Write an enzyme that holds these catalytic residues in place. Structure first.
Site, PDB file in Angstrom:
ATOM      1  N   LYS A 165      -3.048   5.950  -4.386  1.00 56.37           N
ATOM      2  CA  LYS A 165      -4.170   6.790  -4.016  1.00 56.37           C
ATOM      3  C   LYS A 165      -4.086   8.133  -4.729  1.00 56.37           C
ATOM      4  CE  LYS A 165      -4.056   4.641   0.621  1.00 56.37           C
ATOM      5  NZ  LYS A 165      -2.580   4.530   0.786  1.00 56.37           N
ATOM      6  N   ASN A 172       5.216  -9.907  11.477  1.00 56.90           N
ATOM      7  CA  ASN A 172       3.817  -9.626  11.159  1.00 56.90           C
ATOM      8  C   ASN A 172       3.131 -10.663  10.278  1.00 56.90           C
ATOM      9  OD1 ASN A 172       4.012  -7.316  12.736  1.00 56.90           O
ATOM     10  ND2 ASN A 172       4.571  -6.005  10.994  1.00 56.90           N
ATOM     11  N   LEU A 199      -1.823  -0.817  14.175  1.00 57.36           N
ATOM     12  CA  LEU A 199      -0.912  -1.053  15.288  1.00 57.36           C
ATOM     13  C   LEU A 199      -0.755   0.161  16.194  1.00 57.36           C
ATOM     14  CD1 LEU A 199       1.846  -3.102  13.456  1.00 57.36           C
ATOM     15  CD2 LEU A 199      -0.154  -3.916  14.697  1.00 57.36           C
ATOM     16  N   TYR A 219       2.715  10.094  -0.477  1.00 55.24           N
ATOM     17  CA  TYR A 219       3.793   9.563   0.360  1.00 55.24           C
ATOM     18  C   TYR A 219       5.163   9.905  -0.214  1.00 55.24           C
ATOM     19  CZ  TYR A 219      -0.007   6.682   2.341  1.00 55.24           C
ATOM     20  OH  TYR A 219      -1.172   6.245   2.930  1.00 55.24           O
ATOM     21  N   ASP A 224       0.776  -1.227   0.000  1.00 58.19           N
ATOM     22  CA  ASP A 224       0.000   0.000   0.000  1.00 58.19           C
ATOM     23  C   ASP A 224       0.811   1.281   0.000  1.00 58.19           C
ATOM     24  OD1 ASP A 224      -1.362   2.240   1.856  1.00 58.19           O
ATOM     25  OD2 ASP A 224      -2.974   1.189   0.784  1.00 58.19           O
ATOM     26  N   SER A 251      -0.654   3.479  14.876  1.00 60.94           N
ATOM     27  CA  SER A 251      -0.025   4.557  14.110  1.00 60.94           C
ATOM     28  C   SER A 251       1.418   4.846  14.516  1.00 60.94           C
ATOM     29  CB  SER A 251      -0.838   5.853  14.225  1.00 60.94           C
ATOM     30  OG  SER A 251      -0.514   6.566  15.410  1.00 60.94           O
ATOM     31  N   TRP A 260       0.785  15.247  13.163  1.00 60.58           N
ATOM     32  CA  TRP A 260      -0.368  14.503  12.670  1.00 60.58           C
ATOM     33  C   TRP A 260      -1.083  13.690  13.742  1.00 60.58           C
ATOM     34  CZ3 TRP A 260      -1.680  16.134   7.973  1.00 60.58           C
ATOM     35  CH2 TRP A 260      -0.675  16.745   7.200  1.00 60.58           C
ATOM     36  N   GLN A 281     -10.703   2.437   3.000  1.00 60.49           N
ATOM     37  CA  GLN A 281      -9.538   2.337   3.866  1.00 60.49           C
ATOM     38  C   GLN A 281      -9.613   3.426   4.923  1.00 60.49           C
ATOM     39  OE1 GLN A 281      -4.761   3.103   3.554  1.00 60.49           O
ATOM     40  NE2 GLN A 281      -5.644   1.719   2.026  1.00 60.49           N
ATOM     41  N   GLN A 317      13.156  -7.601  11.272  1.00 60.30           N
ATOM     42  CA  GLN A 317      12.591  -8.548  12.227  1.00 60.30           C
ATOM     43  C   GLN A 317      11.074  -8.424  12.363  1.00 60.30           C
ATOM     44  OE1 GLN A 317      14.155  -8.722  16.453  1.00 60.30           O
ATOM     45  NE2 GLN A 317      12.010  -8.198  16.864  1.00 60.30           N
ATOM     46  N   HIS A 330      -7.951   9.285  -1.927  1.00 61.51           N
ATOM     47  CA  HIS A 330      -7.257   9.346  -0.637  1.00 61.51           C
ATOM     48  C   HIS A 330      -7.983  10.057   0.509  1.00 61.51           C
ATOM     49  CE1 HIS A 330      -2.853   9.195   1.045  1.00 61.51           C
ATOM     50  NE2 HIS A 330      -3.748   8.859   1.957  1.00 61.51           N
ATOM     51  N   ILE A 390       9.014  -7.037  10.260  1.00 63.97           N
ATOM     52  CA  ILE A 390       8.365  -7.298   8.980  1.00 63.97           C
ATOM     53  C   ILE A 390       8.038  -8.790   8.911  1.00 63.97           C
ATOM     54  CG2 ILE A 390       8.774  -7.546   6.512  1.00 63.97           C
ATOM     55  CD1 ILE A 390      10.399  -4.924   6.663  1.00 63.97           C
TER      56      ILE A 390
HETATM   57  N1  LIG Z   1      -5.209   6.116   3.489  1.00 67.38           N
HETATM   58  C1  LIG Z   1      -4.890   6.771   4.625  1.00 67.38           C
HETATM   59  O1  LIG Z   1      -5.466   7.812   4.975  1.00 67.38           O
HETATM   60  C2  LIG Z   1      -3.784   6.198   5.494  1.00 67.38           C
HETATM   61  C3  LIG Z   1      -3.413   6.866   6.738  1.00 67.38           C
HETATM   62  C4  LIG Z   1      -2.382   6.354   7.572  1.00 67.38           C
HETATM   63  C5  LIG Z   1      -1.721   5.192   7.184  1.00 67.38           C
HETATM   64  N2  LIG Z   1      -2.090   4.532   5.952  1.00 67.38           N
HETATM   65  C6  LIG Z   1      -1.434   3.284   5.458  1.00 67.38           C
HETATM   66  O2  LIG Z   1      -1.355   2.380   6.536  1.00 67.38           O
HETATM   67  C7  LIG Z   1       0.019   1.954   6.729  1.00 67.38           C
HETATM   68  C8  LIG Z   1       0.223   1.583   8.167  1.00 67.38           C
HETATM   69  O3  LIG Z   1      -0.312   2.582   9.047  1.00 67.38           O
HETATM   70  P1  LIG Z   1       0.591   3.481   9.996  1.00 67.38           P
HETATM   71  O4  LIG Z   1       1.706   4.061   9.223  1.00 67.38           O
HETATM   72  O5  LIG Z   1      -0.264   4.452  10.755  1.00 67.38           O
HETATM   73  O6  LIG Z   1       1.221   2.526  11.077  1.00 67.38           O
HETATM   74  P2  LIG Z   1       0.914   1.130  11.811  1.00 67.38           P
HETATM   75  O7  LIG Z   1       0.812   0.042  10.814  1.00 67.38           O
HETATM   76  O8  LIG Z   1      -0.197   1.372  12.764  1.00 67.38           O
HETATM   77  O9  LIG Z   1       2.283   0.924  12.661  1.00 67.38           O
HETATM   78  C9  LIG Z   1       2.861   1.964  13.478  1.00 67.38           C
HETATM   79  C10 LIG Z   1       4.242   1.488  13.953  1.00 67.38           C
HETATM   80  O10 LIG Z   1       4.204   0.076  14.269  1.00 67.38           O
HETATM   81  C11 LIG Z   1       5.535  -0.399  14.302  1.00 67.38           C
HETATM   82  N3  LIG Z   1       5.460  -1.865  14.176  1.00 67.38           N
HETATM   83  C12 LIG Z   1       5.240  -2.605  13.021  1.00 67.38           C
HETATM   84  N4  LIG Z   1       5.223  -3.910  13.225  1.00 67.38           N
HETATM   85  C13 LIG Z   1       5.439  -4.034  14.565  1.00 67.38           C
HETATM   86  C14 LIG Z   1       5.541  -5.177  15.435  1.00 67.38           C
HETATM   87  N5  LIG Z   1       5.415  -6.424  14.969  1.00 67.38           N
HETATM   88  N6  LIG Z   1       5.774  -4.943  16.787  1.00 67.38           N
HETATM   89  C15 LIG Z   1       5.905  -3.663  17.276  1.00 67.38           C
HETATM   90  N7  LIG Z   1       5.826  -2.513  16.531  1.00 67.38           N
HETATM   91  C16 LIG Z   1       5.591  -2.774  15.177  1.00 67.38           C
HETATM   92  C17 LIG Z   1       6.254   0.335  13.192  1.00 67.38           C
HETATM   93  O11 LIG Z   1       7.605   0.606  13.552  1.00 67.38           O
HETATM   94  P3  LIG Z   1       8.870   0.000  12.745  1.00 67.38           P
HETATM   95  O12 LIG Z   1       8.746   0.455  11.303  1.00 67.38           O
HETATM   96  O13 LIG Z   1      10.038   0.571  13.523  1.00 67.38           O
HETATM   97  O14 LIG Z   1       8.778  -1.498  12.881  1.00 67.38           O
HETATM   98  C18 LIG Z   1       5.400   1.600  12.944  1.00 67.38           C
HETATM   99  O15 LIG Z   1       6.082   2.819  13.139  1.00 67.38           O
HETATM  100  C19 LIG Z   1       0.824   3.144   6.165  1.00 67.38           C
HETATM  101  O16 LIG Z   1       2.206   2.915   5.947  1.00 67.38           O
HETATM  102  C20 LIG Z   1      -0.011   3.496   4.938  1.00 67.38           C
HETATM  103  O17 LIG Z   1       0.367   2.651   3.865  1.00 67.38           O
HETATM  104  C21 LIG Z   1      -3.098   5.031   5.137  1.00 67.38           C
HETATM  105  C1  LIG Z   2      -1.141  10.685   7.050  1.00 67.67           C
HETATM  106  C2  LIG Z   2      -1.240  10.425   5.502  1.00 67.67           C
HETATM  107  C3  LIG Z   2       0.136   9.907   4.976  1.00 67.67           C
HETATM  108  C4  LIG Z   2       1.255  10.977   5.130  1.00 67.67           C
HETATM  109  C5  LIG Z   2       0.876  12.281   4.318  1.00 67.67           C
HETATM  110  C6  LIG Z   2      -0.555  12.801   4.729  1.00 67.67           C
HETATM  111  C7  LIG Z   2      -0.944  14.025   3.855  1.00 67.67           C
HETATM  112  C8  LIG Z   2       0.097  15.164   3.940  1.00 67.67           C
HETATM  113  C9  LIG Z   2       1.534  14.698   3.680  1.00 67.67           C
HETATM  114  C10 LIG Z   2       2.312  15.435   2.841  1.00 67.67           C
HETATM  115  C11 LIG Z   2       3.730  15.091   2.530  1.00 67.67           C
HETATM  116  O1  LIG Z   2       4.386  15.788   1.766  1.00 67.67           O
HETATM  117  C12 LIG Z   2       4.346  13.862   3.199  1.00 67.67           C
HETATM  118  C13 LIG Z   2       3.302  12.837   3.720  1.00 67.67           C
HETATM  119  C14 LIG Z   2       1.999  13.405   4.421  1.00 67.67           C
HETATM  120  C15 LIG Z   2       2.351  13.799   5.886  1.00 67.67           C
HETATM  121  C16 LIG Z   2      -1.610  11.649   4.623  1.00 67.67           C
HETATM  122  C17 LIG Z   2      -3.084  11.883   4.991  1.00 67.67           C
HETATM  123  C18 LIG Z   2      -3.640  10.434   4.999  1.00 67.67           C
HETATM  124  C19 LIG Z   2      -2.451   9.484   5.315  1.00 67.67           C
HETATM  125  O2  LIG Z   2      -2.279   8.581   4.207  1.00 67.67           O
END
Ligand SMILES: NC(=O)c1ccc[n+]([C@@H]2O[C@H](COP(=O)([O-])OP(=O)(O)OC[C@H]3O[C@@H](n4cnc5c(N)ncnc54)[C@H](OP(=O)(O)O)[C@@H]3O)[C@@H](O)[C@H]2O)c1
Ligand SMILES: C[C@]12CC[C@H]3[C@@H](CCC4=CC(=O)CC[C@@]43C)[C@@H]1CC[C@H]2O
Ligand SMILES: NC(=O)c1ccc[n+]([C@@H]2O[C@H](COP(=O)([O-])OP(=O)(O)OC[C@H]3O[C@@H](n4cnc5c(N)ncnc54)[C@H](OP(=O)(O)O)[C@@H]3O)[C@@H](O)[C@H]2O)c1
Ligand SMILES: C[C@]12CC[C@H]3[C@@H](CCC4=CC(=O)CC[C@@]43C)[C@@H]1CC[C@H]2O
Lengths: 321, 321
Positions: free
Chosen positions: A82, A278, A217, A53, A48, A219, A225, A188, A273, A115, A275
């Site tokens: 997105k 999970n 997990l 991003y 994803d 965030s 943010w 999503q 590790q 998005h 990755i």
């Molecule tokens: N569409 C949207 O609006 C939107 C918004 C937010 C996020 N997303 C998507 O969702 C994805 C994931 O969401 P997220 O970025 O908020 O984070 P998340 O998946 O909730 O994870 C947050 C943290 O968990 C840690 N982590 C991962 N596996 C772990 C484990 N097994 N044990 C302990 N900690 C662990 C990571 O650290 P490490 O990297 O250090 O392991 C990471 O910083 C994003 O990368 C993005 O693709 C989409």
């Molecule tokens: C938090 C999230 C991913 C990171 C982006 C954010 C929108 C503004 C942003 C602008 C940037 O130049 C870097 C990423 C980010 C901070 C997004 C809103 C929904 C979610 O996907």
């Protein structure tokens, strides 16, 4: 070549466990490349990302590399991009998709999502602001944006199309749109034990729309943010207890929770590790009593408000759901 | 090409919807040949049979036929056979599997199960009886039988091995067996809204054993195996009401129910119409409320008691679960 997936309302299949690629600004983009390759090596088949991003060049390279060396076939990678808010205007949707495809060097994306429902002014800047720092909002009929998305699907540029951060009203708006050709395959949104989206989930289920959970997990908890005063999900006593009981981790319990309630879940990690850890989500199961124990953790804690986009009518988080 | 499967505890993958092949004695075997062919065309990728069904020759023909004309590849067919009770003795297990494979003209089965925990005397007759009309039971250590099953998996004759009609005590017997090499990947048992096996299901989940449901549609109600005065599942008001709203059928509600509670479900139909209908289980979803409504139908109604096998220490249905 086998793994767990779910059938979308448009006939395509989505791997139930996805790899998140979004990372904080202070993290070099080179990390996305190495991370995605390790994710594919570990067994992730769903990746994803998004134009906003600013990592699609690296993520696309990881995918191309793993395909080019025989590790995986293109049909065995489900990649999501997105459409960012600066391209909500109908005539700008396809150009945005084609721009992402060029950065990725892929012929199509398996899934393309709107998005965020709040639109901003066209241009290169993802968050356009005037001379006084005010975000430059734009007025766009999302139903029109959707028609442009449907055309991208008919053009084969996107296998499936869906939305992200949409609420009950916004979904209904799309589903009740006259002449609708394709329902969104998913929505999503943020989803974890502290904000389980029970209500929105049931609504999506009643329309055969898949809810894809982000921040499953807890965030990244990065400012500005996410509020640092917010509870730390993975430190929750119930999750820790269950982890110890199953000989797993709080993160794994949180992920398994989503899979068993019918949610497709994302998990981001740039640590080799974690990755590999999970992917263990497919190695165990939770009982009904344990699932209920996790349901009890719900506490209306939304980590990502994106309130800088609050104001316009389309801001999604004001309604109950 | 792609379809919904669950990862078993031995690394192999099982399609969540299976096609049942057991048919009444007064039904030509040629009916199975045609049925399986239709099931495969409809999209079933999991076929369930057994030596005691006396149809493996036809079932095998149907499968090899669909593979012959390119309708599907061997790796996209998950075939299950079962060891009957007249072959529980250790030195009789591999021969029984080899006999099934010879009838099927296949090199291996994807799953081989101990069909029923009560043993009967070796011989061609599947239900041998004495002069007074009583069944000629045999005494066999199921742990020895399991060790023979494990050797069949190591020999490559069965990709995975499991059990059927085992209760809590019997599962623990295997799980706690000294020197255990492979846990059973599943426990195929009767399961439906009138007998949802909640307790046994949870136990299985706690050990990562998949519960596979048979008679998920209320069984064939064929005497003297099933009491004719037993409630008719597919005529239940709640299921009928839910079927009306979703624009489906009571059978589909009952099948979907199982999929959402983590159960792999079997569906037997020799009718081309009902065969294609059951595959529609992947087209909709049930809300938490609808699921709770179905849980409420539970009423301790076991259709298949197989009480003719009652008496031996291993008869499975006397315990609470
Ligand atoms: N569409 C949207 O609006 C939107 C918004 C937010 C996020 N997303 C998507 O969702 C994805 C994931 O969401 P997220 O970025 O908020 O984070 P998340 O998946 O909730 O994870 C947050 C943290 O968990 C840690 N982590 C991962 N596996 C772990 C484990 N097994 N044990 C302990 N900690 C662990 C990571 O650290 P490490 O990297 O250090 O392991 C990471 O910083 C994003 O990368 C993005 O693709 C989409
Ligand atoms: C938090 C999230 C991913 C990171 C982006 C954010 C929108 C503004 C942003 C602008 C940037 O130049 C870097 C990423 C980010 C901070 C997004 C809103 C929904 C979610 O996907
Ligand atoms: N391991 C064990 O101990 C065990 C025991 C029993 C069964 N099984 C397995 O489970 C399979 C299925 O179980 P089962 O034979 O008890 O029956 P079932 O699958 O519960 O179905 C019973 C009846 O439902 C009808 N049916 C099927 N689809 C329908 C639909 N969409 N709408 C309305 N009616 C429908 C069928 O009639 P039509 O054929 O006329 O369509 C069939 O006679 C067996 O064939 C066998 O492979 C295993
Ligand atoms: C009812 C069930 C399937 C049908 C068989 C039965 C055992 C005796 C039998 C012997 C036969 O020659 C035909 C099938 C069947 C009647 C099985 C016991 C468990 C279940 O799989």
């Amino acid at each position: 070549s086998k793994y767990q997936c779910v059938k979308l309302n448009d006939g395509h299949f989505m791997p139930v466990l996805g790899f998140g690629t979004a990372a904080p600004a202070e993290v070099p983009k080179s990390k996305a490349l190495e991370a995605v390759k390790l994710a594919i090596e570990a067994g992730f088949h769903h990746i994803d990302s998004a134009h906003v991003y600013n990592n699609e060049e690296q993520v696309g390279l990881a995918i191309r590399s793993k395909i080019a060396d025989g590790s995986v076939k293109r049909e065995d990678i489900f990649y999501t991009s997105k459409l960012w808010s600066n391209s909500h205007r109908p005539e700008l949707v396809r150009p945005a998709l084609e721009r992402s495809l060029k950065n990725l060097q892929l012929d199509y994306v398996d899934l393309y999502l709107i998005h965020f429902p709040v639109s901003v002014k066209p241009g290169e800047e993802v968050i356009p602001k005037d001379e006084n720092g005010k975000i430059l909002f734009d007025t766009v009929d999302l139903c029109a944006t959707w028609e442009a998305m449907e055309k991208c699907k008919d053009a084969g540029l996107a296998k499936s199309i869906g939305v992200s951060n949409f609420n009950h009203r916004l979904l209904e708006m799309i589903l009740n749109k006259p002449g609708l050709k394709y329902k969104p395959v998913c929505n999503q949104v943020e989803c974890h034990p502290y904000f389980n989206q029970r209500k929105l989930l049931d609504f999506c289920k009643s329309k055969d729309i898949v809810l894809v959970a982000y921040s499953a997990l807890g965030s990244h908890r990065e400012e500005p943010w996410v509020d640092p005063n917010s509870p730390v999900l993975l430190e929750d006593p119930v999750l820790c207890a269950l982890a110890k009981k199953h000989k797993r981790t709080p993160a794994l319990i949180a992920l398994r929770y989503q899979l068993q309630r019918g949610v497709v879940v994302l998990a981001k990690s740039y640590n080799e590790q974690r990755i590999r850890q999970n992917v263990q989500v497919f190695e165990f199961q939770l009982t009904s009593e344990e699932m209920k124990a996790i349901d009890g953790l719900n506490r209306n804690v939304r980590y990502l408000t994106l309130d800088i986009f609050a104001g316009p009518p389309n801001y999604p988080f004001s309604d109950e759901y």
